[PDB]
Amino acid sequence: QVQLVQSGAEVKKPGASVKVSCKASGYTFTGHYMHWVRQAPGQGLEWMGWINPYSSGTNYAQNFQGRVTMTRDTSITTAYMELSRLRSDDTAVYYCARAPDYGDRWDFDYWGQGTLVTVFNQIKGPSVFPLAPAALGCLVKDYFPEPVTVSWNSGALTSGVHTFPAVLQSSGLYSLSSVVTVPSSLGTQTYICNVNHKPSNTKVDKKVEP
Amino acid sequence: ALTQPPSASGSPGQSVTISCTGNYVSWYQQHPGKAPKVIIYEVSKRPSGVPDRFSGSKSGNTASLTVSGLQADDEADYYCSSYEVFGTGTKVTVLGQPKAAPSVTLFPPSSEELQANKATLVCLISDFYPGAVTVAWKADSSPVKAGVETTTPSKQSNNKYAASSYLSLTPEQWKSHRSYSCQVTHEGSTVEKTVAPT
Amino acid sequence: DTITLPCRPAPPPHCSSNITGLILTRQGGANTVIFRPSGGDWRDIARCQIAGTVVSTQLFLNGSLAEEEVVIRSEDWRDNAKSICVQLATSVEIACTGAGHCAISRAKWANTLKQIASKLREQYGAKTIIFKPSSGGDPEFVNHSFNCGGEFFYCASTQLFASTWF
Ligand SMILES: *[C@@H]1O[C@H](CO)[C@@H](O)[C@H](O)[C@H]1NC(C)=O
Ligand SMILES: *[C@@H]1O[C@H](CO)[C@@H](O)[C@H](O)[C@H]1NC(C)=O
């Protein structure tokens, strides 16, 4: 039974390096090229390069040349992929994948389970801005880590509130938008979002007015 | 350099046919949280254990995968490939509820954010099924890729899907263009919202 | 800008509600008609059949709304011993502070009473519609009272019913 077992998930800051390991068993380790493929969250697959485990020769994708190093250790039949100078847009699942045989080097027949590498910025409390209207809301911008709590009118307003899941931005920071649906009624009812980010002891109230 | 439709869907027992436009082509299936798996190689050949309801062909510059007799476990992302090149991918949904068109709300930057010398456009998308949308931002009819961050879709409490997309701009960029648009496409149907300074 | 009702004990903010209707008594015995929060009891409220899951007096909270405009009903309009059920079309938020008061938009409450008066006017003819405070009663009925979060709250409603519409 061919198995490719990868190292566990990794959490890094910008500028760090990561090295993912891929332990092979059940076949001739030096007999199959090993490829690396990554996939940013919600995005497609991207080939990074291959290593020939017999010679340790390599062929990196041009857009990673200078930043990636692929190596192996035949004594423990392990292949490695090191990516340096990480930015938050390098957040992705990284896979090792085996060439099937000598003649077919690209119909990857066995894959590792994947290694999630997430690259986050420093702890930071959110900035909060109004989303004026009907739909109105609050933009909860550039914070780390999860979670934040958003209430409206100190909890007096609960129905009609849709708080969207946060996006992890290329800055390594998160950003979500809590919005409320109203009839409009805007001139009378006052709307305030209450944002609490406990990891940074940030608490902010913001009035949302057209 | 291999282009695929962003999404495709069918009910159990129907089929989906996925094109791959640019040699040989192969196809991978990828379930959520799992590694991809080869299901077609050398245009039309099935690996051992892949049922014959998966088929493939190629004509000229275009290859296509068909999954026939759809089953729930066919819900997955599908990628074509040729040597190191992967296609852009197709999210396949096996329909489990009525389809629903996305509702789109687009907010311009706030005065307060502009005073902090920042600007963010917020495009909120909700109540759609299948849970796959393509979000494209435009600065005066021209595509803008820099500054875009888009979530994967997430289930709402009503079993439909939501997603959000953000465009980060400098105040100078916001104030210099005539308008910005968030365009969201759902199985080839496109709607667009537009905001403008002042 | 707000009609502020004093309440005991102090309802917390998460106990704020939408006022979706109310229940009135027409004073018995000058071309004017006087209405007060109901002198009835739970039986009157149940017969209205527009309440939600919230148990409350004088005002229906988180209940059913009418489609287009205010709807008023009675088992008998000529019988001052039977209450008048008022179903609103747009809710009126009552927001509690947690410090002892719950607040209603004065502007929206005046506009709501104006429409109620118009509906009452097309039922009793007449010209002048007057709202007055409760004639009296046990604490749960002379006050706008309601349950929330394991507690029962009593809010004096005097400021909600003192106005003349000609
Ligand atoms: C009425 O509904 C709101 C919103 O769901 C809720 O917070 C409040 O507790 C309800 N009111 C009562 C009295 O239960
Ligand atoms: C009243 O209903 C509106 C929708 O009409 C809802 O947004 C609001 O949260 C409700 N208010 C309370 C206090 O439950």
Author numbering:
A (entry chain H): 1 to 52, 52A, 53 to 82, 82A, 82B, 82C, 83 to 100, 100A, ...
B (entry chain L): 3 to 9, 11 to 25, 31 to 91, 96 to 210
C (entry chain C): 1 to 29, 33 to 169
Sentences from the paper on this structure:
In a double-blinded, placebo-controlled phase 1 human clinical trial, the recombinant, germline-targeting envelope glycoprotein (Env) trimer BG505 SOSIP.v4.1-GT1.1, adjuvanted with AS01B, induced bnAb precursors of the VRC01-class at a high frequency in the majority of vaccine recipients. These bnAb precursors, that target the CD4 receptor binding site, had undergone somatic hypermutation characteristic of the VRC01-class. The GT strategy for inducing VRC01-class bnAb precursors is rooted in the hypothesis that these antibodies target the CD4bs with a similar angle of approach to VRC01 and use the same conserved contact residues. To verify that VRC01-class mAbs elicited by GT1.1 do not just exhibit similar sequence features to VRC01-class bnAbs but also target the CD4bs in a similar manner and with the same atomic contacts, we selected five mAbs for further structural characterization.
One priming immunogen designed to bind to VRC01-class B cell precursors is the eOD-GT8–60mer, which consists of a modified and multimerized gp120 fragment. Moreover, VRC01-class bnAbs have very distinct and targetable genetic and structural characteristics. Specifically, they have restricted immunoglobulin heavy chain variable region alleles (IGHV1–2*02 or *04) and a short five amino acid light chain complementarity determining region 3 (CDRL3). First, VRC01-class bnAbs typically have a tyrosine at position 95 (Y95CDRL3) and a glutamic acid at position 96 (E96), which are important contact residues with the conserved Env loop D (N279Env/N280Env). Finally, GT1.1-induced VRC01-class mAbs are structurally extremely similar to VRC01-class bnAbs.
